[PDB]
Amino acid sequence: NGFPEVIYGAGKTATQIVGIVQALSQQTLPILTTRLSAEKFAALQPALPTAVYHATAQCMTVGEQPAPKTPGYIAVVTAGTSDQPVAEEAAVTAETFGNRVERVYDVGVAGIHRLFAKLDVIRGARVVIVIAGMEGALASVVGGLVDKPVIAVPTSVGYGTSFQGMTALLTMLNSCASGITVVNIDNGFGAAYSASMVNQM
Amino acid sequence: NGFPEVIYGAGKTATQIVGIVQALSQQTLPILTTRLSAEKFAALQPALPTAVYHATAQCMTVGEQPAPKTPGYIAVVTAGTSDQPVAEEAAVTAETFGNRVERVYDVGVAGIHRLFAKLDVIRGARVVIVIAGMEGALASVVGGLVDKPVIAVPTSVGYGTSFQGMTALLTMLNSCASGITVVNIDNGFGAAYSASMVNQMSHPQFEK
Amino acid sequence: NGFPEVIYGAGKTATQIVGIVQALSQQTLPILTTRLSAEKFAALQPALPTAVYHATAQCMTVGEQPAPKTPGYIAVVTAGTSDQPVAEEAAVTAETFGNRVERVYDVGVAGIHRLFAKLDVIRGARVVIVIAGMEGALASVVGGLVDKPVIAVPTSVGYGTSFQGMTALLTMLNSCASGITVVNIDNGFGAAYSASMVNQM
Amino acid sequence: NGFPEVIYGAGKTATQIVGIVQALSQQTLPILTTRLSAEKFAALQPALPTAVYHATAQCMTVGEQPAPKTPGYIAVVTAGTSDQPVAEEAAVTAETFGNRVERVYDVGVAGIHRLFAKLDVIRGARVVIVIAGMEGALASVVGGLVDKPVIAVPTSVGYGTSFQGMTALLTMLNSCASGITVVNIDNGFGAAYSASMVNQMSHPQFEK
Amino acid sequence: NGFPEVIYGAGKTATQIVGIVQALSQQTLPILTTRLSAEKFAALQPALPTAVYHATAQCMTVGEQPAPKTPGYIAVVTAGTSDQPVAEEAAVTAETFGNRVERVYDVGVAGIHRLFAKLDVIRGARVVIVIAGMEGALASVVGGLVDKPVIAVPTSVGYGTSFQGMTALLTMLNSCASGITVVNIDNGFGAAYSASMVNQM
Amino acid sequence: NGFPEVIYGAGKTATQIVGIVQALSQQTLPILTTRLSAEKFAALQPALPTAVYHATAQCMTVGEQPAPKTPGYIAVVTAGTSDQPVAEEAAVTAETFGNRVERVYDVGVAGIHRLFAKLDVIRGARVVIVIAGMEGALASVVGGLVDKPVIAVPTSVGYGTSFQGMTALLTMLNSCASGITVVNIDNGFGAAYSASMVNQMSHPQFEK
Amino acid sequence: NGFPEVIYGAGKTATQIVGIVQALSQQTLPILTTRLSAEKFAALQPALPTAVYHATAQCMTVGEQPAPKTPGYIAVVTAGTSDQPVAEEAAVTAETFGNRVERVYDVGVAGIHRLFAKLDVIRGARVVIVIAGMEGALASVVGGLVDKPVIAVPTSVGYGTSFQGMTALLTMLNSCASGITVVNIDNGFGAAYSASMVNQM
Amino acid sequence: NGFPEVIYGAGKTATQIVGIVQALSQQTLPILTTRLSAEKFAALQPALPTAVYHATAQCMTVGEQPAPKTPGYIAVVTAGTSDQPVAEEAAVTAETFGNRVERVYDVGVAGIHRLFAKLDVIRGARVVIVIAGMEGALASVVGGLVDKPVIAVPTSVGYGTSFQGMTALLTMLNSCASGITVVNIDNGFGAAYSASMVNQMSHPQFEK
Ligand SMILES: [Mg+2]
Ligand SMILES: [Mg+2]
Ligand SMILES: [Mg+2]
Ligand SMILES: [Mg+2]
Ligand SMILES: [Zn+2]
Ligand SMILES: [Zn+2]
Ligand SMILES: [Zn+2]
Ligand SMILES: [Zn+2]
Structure with missing residues (x-):
């Protein structure tokens, strides 16, 4: 291991x-x-x-965190500030597992320019973890712009029709972009666990 | 009326x-x-x-289709080729209600470069109907890029947990603060009926 | 803008x-x-x-609220008192956005006469925002009586089968009157944002 | 019995x-x-x-249909023409159970003037069966206007998130304090079976 | 009225x-x-x-409650003690509306003999209001044994698969006995309102 | 095995x-x-x-059906005639697994007198399979009257909000403290496979 | 009795x-x-x-608990520690009912070896009660390895897509192993009640 | 690309x-x-x-299927014979995307000995696609036994409350901390498209 x-x-x-x-x-x-x-x-x-x-x-x-096991990095992408707690669980889990991590936060598509302002960073990752609740559509937009594994994480922070992450889960499962894979709600740890394996092939 | x-x-x-x-x-x-x-x-x-x-x-x-009553147009925007049937329901009722329609089909977000290619035509509409299934991400992206009223139609095309348009509908409904408003699954007619009211909000009496 | x-x-x-x-x-x-x-x-x-x-x-x-940008008015219609908080979010958002607003409250169909007592006001609006939770049927009744854009807002205030606005959402999506358009639950802001655009064509 | x-x-x-x-x-x-x-x-x-x-x-x-046992009637009220099949199930079992029926079809709320046109006939029933799909608003409106018991039937006609009558059923159930009571989707027979009990709550022995 | x-x-x-x-x-x-x-x-x-x-x-x-408007009585039947609050709302509403009321409580079918011990009382009512949450099956059993209008009330008191009355609602809507009519969850008032009308024909 | x-x-x-x-x-x-x-x-x-x-x-x-291995029997109890197909799936696998079966069909609760008519036969089983759709009330009633293990099968027959057996399943699941246990919708085979294990919990070696 | x-x-x-x-x-x-x-x-x-x-x-x-009514034992199997409260309700109910009980806890399939480490105990029971929430799959794995009645109990302890035991309930109902029978969520008592009957044939 | x-x-x-x-x-x-x-x-x-x-x-x-681009393989693991259609969709797109595939079919958990029989082949993959319906337990078991990335596909085969793959999907999603990741119901193509990216993360220039 x-x-x-x-x-x-x-x-x-x-x-x-x-x-x-x-x-x-x-x-x-x-x-x-x-x-x-x-x-x-x-x-x-x-x-x-x-x-x-x-x-x-x-x-x-x-414990003493030793150097990253591998040069490439995991990108952790979030739609909005309400996503930060579970994105941070993915970033800390990935870093503790030995991966370099690039945090790309607050790039939800209501201001899509922010997503393009940081697109070279997303494109240079070996793995992308996308985290969203309201703007669950972000997984599909990211997945359509990158050629690397994307692991989507739905979060439970939202309003009435968010169904406490359930809409976000169905949205990511149904992305029209290919190459998106999904974990259960709020499970930032699980996403980083898998992303870490993928990163360290 | x-x-x-x-x-x-x-x-x-x-x-x-x-x-x-x-x-x-x-x-x-x-x-x-x-x-x-x-x-x-x-x-x-x-x-x-x-x-x-x-x-x-x-x-x-x-009966013959009227000449457009207002000078603007309605943009009918589509994520994929299989959104075309409820897009054509929307576009044919819009044209039958006296509106000029501009079709921007098959600009879904798996190749979002295609949507930017036509963004001049979308911003230039008075109303925008956005039609999408699966994630339904297209409505969010459009809603954030245009400052015209947008009416989003979820379609029932999809597989598995598509749940016959529910995923699309719920996703579009969670982007309304972007200036988006939503109708029922596959309801292209409903969308165009409203867009038509919005788009239609005279002729000089003394000519030679 | x-x-x-x-x-x-x-x-x-x-x-x-x-x-x-x-x-x-x-x-x-x-x-x-x-x-x-x-x-x-x-x-x-x-x-x-x-x-x-x-x-x-x-x-x-x-800030200094300047005069309305436009003469016509948005009508904000509610079914009952439980709807007042989110209707007020629509009225204040619309007024701050520069629209004149006419508040038509407590006209749910269990006393439909109240709806007719105020019908000339609804009919004179450029846009109607309908807000309901229990009596979500009100959107359809209003939509059948007016020839202007109607934006329906479901609210989460209700009893057991209200499903915290979900029934109201499905009811408005399924109106038999044409010309009704729907926002997500409790989203009075979103309704006024759109109504404002429609009003100020 | x-x-x-x-x-x-x-x-x-x-x-x-x-x-x-x-x-x-x-x-x-x-x-x-x-x-x-x-x-x-x-x-x-x-x-x-x-x-x-x-x-x-x-x-x-x-067997031949009986002569009405009570002098009142049951009003079968309908939102749209596609509610007619479970309306006719309700009206044919009501008549077979010995009740006089008065049909008030196609007075849904997209043209509510039609419902006021017939409101004399509805108030004059002993029981009212209201049949509607889609929103199912018709039951609420009727429930608030009449002081007779009302039994609401949701129908499964509709599209998209119609969910095969669920939207109608849930909407009618949220108007019960108006004196409304509800049966299962498309259950015109059930409605008429109850209305018949309500409507039926003698003949002089010495004639010439 | x-x-x-x-x-x-x-x-x-x-x-x-x-x-x-x-x-x-x-x-x-x-x-x-x-x-x-x-x-x-x-x-x-x-x-x-x-x-x-x-x-x-x-x-x-x-106010001064005057005598019952009518001789027959409404029977209010409950499955268990958890049903008592909403059954009592039906009994008090019916009594205030002028109906005589016979309270038949705790006759759920896990001890069906209790239901038979009180069956002559149920059979003599002009209207029966059945109230249940867990043992929502009671509406169907009562409906199969009586020849009068039965109005079923689902309640929200239950365990995990009770879905806060939703199972009870679907159970009563789906009774195999005919002649059962249903109100929304916890709505004891609504049931008595209708039962009162039916009783006072 | x-x-x-x-x-x-x-x-x-x-x-x-x-x-x-x-x-x-x-x-x-x-x-x-x-x-x-x-x-x-x-x-x-x-x-x-x-x-x-x-x-x-x-x-x-x-292959030929075995002679019953145990002396008891399994009671297969049914609410209505349309429960008969998953009842016969249960009864035919039970008999194929070496159990004697006693069929008590069509004793649903709209005529509960029929269930009391056969209550001697049900109490005398070692296991009871109860099969019902719609409300699924039959399982609760049986569970409270017998002190043998009961296995309840919801069937998918019904209309409207029957939701293809969900109402039945959920209703039966809410009676488990009565000694009831449940399988999946229409799963007569599963029920009989378990009943068979329960029912089967020797032959003298020295005969003439 | x-x-x-x-x-x-x-x-x-x-x-x-x-x-x-x-x-x-x-x-x-x-x-x-x-x-x-x-x-x-x-x-x-x-x-x-x-x-x-x-x-x-x-x-x-x-009361004075007398000796077990019968020699064989009920096995109570759990996926994880979050399952312990409702498993303990099954063990105490079974013991009070007169059954010997063997408690086999924390054998969820993320460490399947633990399940095999205790498999002879499960195989020697007359009845097995399986209790799980997140790792509801455990019922099917146990059911595929034993030739005795298995009664599955879903619990409500879980994360977002656990739907408060509902996923676990559907998982156990849908086991691909035959011979699994299910009770309602959290109902450890009910499982032991039935298991006790089965055990004491 | x-x-x-x-x-x-x-x-x-x-x-x-x-x-x-x-x-x-x-x-x-x-x-x-x-x-x-x-x-x-x-x-x-x-x-x-x-x-x-x-x-x-x-x-x-x-077009002809390529020679595998990487030296590893992708393991396509299957619970039952009826999982074979979305397994073959996964395996045929994986092979078309240039990957070597190793098929481990019909090792569902009702005979888990079969899965241990092939566990050498599964651990030796670079990625593992696990395909299952009904409970979908197979993904959990595999996820806990291998330290390679696993991609789980729920299939829509089943009966009753199978809910067309929902039970499978939700069950697999509740095992992600085991190193499992999930796609939509029946989405073998999606699974293989990702596995292919993972599996594919040169040829010496000077030969004779
Ligand atoms: Mg906008
Ligand atoms: Mg009334
Ligand atoms: Mg029992
Ligand atoms: Mg793993
Ligand atoms: Zn899309
Ligand atoms: Zn209507
Ligand atoms: Zn029944
Ligand atoms: Zn399996």
């Missing part, structure tokens, strides 16, 4: 987590903890003073 | 529509018949000798 | 907003801020003493 | 229904057969020589 | 309500207020000392 | 199933083929001369 | 429950109370000092 | 596709036509004499 150790922090207590983390005391490899509330990192910090917490991403990393 | 008479032919038979058309033929000039299957017209055709069937729109008109 | 500047206040902090508003210090044009909680206008008011807050609408306007 | 015998013919064959009808023909006077396709009756028809097929209702009766 | 005056208390304030109630100071007829929280009747009571509040039903009645 | 071999014939052709049956005919005694349309068997029939088609169950067996 | 007395504690007050429990003062048989909050057992304990409360299961048992 | 040209033939006629193919035949080497019904090819076939129809994939190629 070489895959860092991943702790799903949703169902675990701060004590239970320190118990898993320090039980991995023998690893030169980093440890990622995803879906970790700020109130729970508050609890953890005295036990793990060498840990790093990423507010938006709700991710914690313990 | 000034509107043509409209017959919804999906539920009705050939015999039944000949009745309506011959009862309305007393006046009113143009008569628009929507959702008329190729087979129903074939059975109509000898009874109504002046009717024109617009095959791919699945529409039938009797 | 001539369109006033619009700030979506849902995802932004009171400080972030003052930052956008005062960064538009060079505009003779008004600035509309939609979806702004009363607790957030509480925060804003010392910074923007010249601002106006509309309670029902959750809209804030900074 | 006093009710006619009822055969639901949708799932059954021609051969199978001849069996039931000849087994029930021993007594019971009128026999109502619902959802009988035009083709099934054509195959029935020679075996049951007294059966009458009501084509557009897709119903079959054997 | 003779129908008492009905106030939907959901969207109105305690002050707004006293304003409607006392504006009906000239009526020998009662006034029903439905969907009224106990905290809101707490507010009302000093203004309306002659009012009556029904806890389960969330209904308030002001 | 001791189970017969099972071929799901819905997706497969006639040619394809002859292949499977002749490849499995080497041993295994009885072969159960489910969802075999009347037309597919007609095309099979000359190639497999010992196969018996159970028309209304839409099942095909080759 | 011999079935212990079961109290559904969801809709009942702590006082109402003591009222039912002590009204069963004449029983050599145990009494199970399911769906009982810890705050409600807090209330009960002074009245019923001989009661036992199971935290995860939210079950209370009063 | 280097990709073959792709024609989506579901919505198009025979006449219409001959047009596209003869207009694209000027260059581009291989032309992949998806969702081409057996009847449409029969009508195409005389006009395009070099076209090969892959019946069970419902695909048509013109």
Whole structure:
């Protein structure tokens, strides 16, 4: 593998987590903890003073992050600011997994020029992760402009007909551009996990 | 009013529509018949000798199409070639309601360069009808690029979780703050009926 | 355009907003801020003493509103009192955009006479915005009685089978009257944005 | 009891229904057969020589229709011409259950003046069956204007997000505080079966 | 009519309500207020000392209730205790409307004998209102055993696949017994309104 | 194991199933083929001369049906006559898996007296399969009256918001605390496969 | 029967429950109370000092549990830790009903080896209850490896496309392995009730 | 780019596709036509004499299939025999896009021993396409056992609450943290188009 150790922090207590983390005391490899509330990192910090917490991403990393495993980069593209929390979970997961990451945020198609202003960056990625909720159409527009794997992530932030990400999920599954592959809602971690594999062939 | 008479032919038979058309033929000039299957017209055709069937729109008109009443036009914009049937329903009722139509077909977002190629023609419309299935992304992109009212039609073409146009409809509905407004799945007639009202919002009395 | 500047206040902090508003210090044009909680206008008011807050609408306007751009008016029609908050977001958005607005409230069809009591007002509008949740049927009844563009807005206020506006959305999409066009749920802003364009041809 | 015998013919064959009808023909006077396709009756028809097929209702009766048992009537009110098949199912079972029916067809809300034209006849019913598809607005409007019990039937006619009558059903269900009550999609028989109970809630013994 | 005056208390304030109630100071007829929280009747009571509040039903009645308008009775049938609040809204609405009411509670089919133990009461009603959520099947069982109008009311009290009354709604719409008519979820008022009309032919 | 071999014939052709049956005919005694349309068997029939088609169950067996392995029986209980096809699928696979079956058809709840008439036979089963569409009330009623395991099958027969068995399925699922357990819509085979395991939970070695 | 007395504690007050429990003062048989909050057992304990409360299961048992009625055992299989509360309701219900129970937890297929590490235990049960939410696929995998009745229980613990157990319900109904039978969501009690009957033939 | 040209033939006629193919035949080497019904090819076939129809994939190629561009392979893994049509769509477009494919059909989880039998071949792929209907459990099991990217395709084969692939799709989507990624129902072409990009991430210039 070489895959860092991943702790799903949703169902675990701060004590239970320190118990898993320090039980991995023998690893030169980093440890990622995803879906970790700020109130729970508050609890953890005295036990793990060498840990790093990423507010938006709700991710914690313990350990020395070594250099990127590979030169190419993953691009993480978002439609709007409401998408930032789950995009950040994809960026931190990908970086902890050893990938260089280029963050291309707020390029939703209501101001499509912003998407073109940053298009050379998207086109130079080995993998593109597209993240959207309201403007789920962005996956299809990105997918029509790039010749690399695109992994779409629907998010649950939206209004009434967003159906808490469900519309966004169906929109990405139904993209008229080919080459788009989809993960379940809010699952930025899952997208980065796959993108990391694809990137490090 | 000034509107043509409209017959919804999906539920009705050939015999039944000949009745309506011959009862309305007393006046009113143009008569628009929507959702008329190729087979129903074939059975109509000898009874109504002046009717024109617009095959791919699945529409039938009797009476001659008017000269455009306003100087603008309506842009009918299309994502793919399979959006053409409800696009032609929209464009044929728009023309029958007295509007000039400009067709911008097959500029979906898998080759968005094609949409920029025609963006001069779209911005120059008074109203824009955008027709798309699958993701329905085309409406969002158009809505953000033009400052004219846009009316989005989701089509039922697709596969799998296409859910017969639902994905398209819901996606277009989530772009309304861009100046977009939406009708029901495959409802090209409805779209054109509204665009026509918008597009139509005189002739000098003393000539030689 | 001539369109006033619009700030979506849902995802932004009171400080972030003052930052956008005062960064538009060079505009003779008004600035509309939609979806702004009363607790957030509480925060804003010392910074923007010249601002106006509309309670029902959750809209804030900074700037000198100049005269209507055009003589005709938009009619905003509602089924019941539960519809007032999102109807008010349509009325304030339309007025800030430069349209004269005639408010025709509480004319749901359980007392259809109220709808006829105010029918000359609806018929004289250039555009009609119809707003309903329970009595979503009102869009179709209005659409059958007027010869102008009607933009229907479903709202999320209702009981069990209202499906939080979803029934109302399907009802308006399926109107048997022609000439009705629909926006997503609760999106009074969007309706006024379009109605404003239509009005000012 | 006093009710006619009822055969639901949708799932059954021609051969199978001849069996039931000849087994029930021993007594019971009128026999109502619902959802009988035009083709099934054509195959029935020679075996049951007294059966009458009501084509557009897709119903079959054997035995003569009774004289109305109560003096009121049931109003069957319809939004559009394509609501006529489940309207005729409602009206033919109502008449077969011994009720006088008054048909008020094609008064949907796109021309609501037509509904006011007949409002005298609707208020004068004892029960009102309202039949509509698409929005189903007609039931709300009727429910608010009459103070008799109303039973609303959603029909499955429509297009797109019509969802085969769901939009109609849900819309009618959201008007029940107006004195409206609802049955399943296309269930004209169910509606008339209840209206008939409501409408039927004597003959002097000493005559010359 | 003779129908008492009905106030939907959901969207109105305690002050707004006293304003409607006392504006009906000239009526020998009662006034029903439905969907009224106990905290809101707490507010009302000093203004309306002659009012009556029904806890389960969330209904308030002001006025002298005169004798039943008619001899026959409405039967209100429930599947279980979770149905009691909305059944009580049907019973109080029917009684205020002038109907005698016979309450037949907790006869769900998991103990069908209870339903037979009270069957003569159900069979003697002019109208039966059936109320269920989990055991929505009860409408069909009752409808198969009685020869009078049955109005079914689905309720939102249930577990995961109850879909907050939606299953119960579809179950009653699809009863294999004929003669069942359905109202929207939780709408005990609506059922009694119709049942009252049917009862008083 | 001791189970017969099972071929799901819905997706497969006639040619394809002859292949499977002749490849499995080497041993295994009885072969159960489910969802075999009347037309597919007609095309099979000359190639497999010992196969018996159970028309209304839409099942095909080759090999002779065993003598019941356990002394109890399985009760297959049915709400209406149109539940008979998935009832016969359940009853024919149960009998092919070596169980005695007792059929209690057409005791739905619109005439619940019929269910009490046969309640002696239902209580006396070891397992009970209950098959119903529409409301699916029958499963609840049965679940509350018997203290044997009950397996409920929703059927897809119905109209309107029947939603092709969903209403039935959801209704049965909301009665599980009564000792009821549920399978997928129309899945009579699945039900009987489980009932058979439950029903089958020896022969003296020294006879004359 | 011999079935212990079961109290559904969801809709009942702590006082109402003591009222039912002590009204069963004449029983050599145990009494199970399911769906009982810890705050409600807090209330009960002074009245019923001989009661036992199971935290995860939210079950209370009063009475002397006698020996298992039968030698074979029910196996209770879970996909992950989020499934433990409703699996525990199945285990406690089955044990109170007189069945021996073998708890096989955390064997979801993302680490399928754990499922094989405990496969002899699953194969030796007379009945298997499978409990899953996210990894609802586990029912089908278990059902393909065992020759005994399998009763699947979907749970509501999950992420966006879990639809609060609904996906898990459809997944179990649609298992490609035969011999799987399904209960409604979260209904661990119901599964054990049936499993108990099947076990004690 | 280097990709073959792709024609989506579901919505198009025979006449219409001959047009596209003869207009694209000027260059581009291989032309992949998806969702081409057996009847449409029969009508195409005389006009395009070099076209090969892959019946069970419902695909048509013109031009010869390339030699694999990369040395790895793509594993196409299948739960059941009825997953074979969208598996063959995936495998035929993968091979047409220049990839070596290894087919691991009919290893669904009702006999999971079959999947372990071939696990050597699956781990040895560079990408894995997993195709399943009904529960769709196969994708989860595969996702947890391999450390290569997996692309899961839900198929619409099933019965009842299969909901035409929804159960499969939703189940696969709930296993993405295992390194799984998903496409739309029956979208074998989409899956192979992505797998092909992943699998394809030189030839020495100086030979004798
Ligand atoms: Mg715009
Ligand atoms: Mg009324
Ligand atoms: Mg039982
Ligand atoms: Mg993996
Ligand atoms: Zn598109
Ligand atoms: Zn209508
Ligand atoms: Zn039934
Ligand atoms: Zn499978």
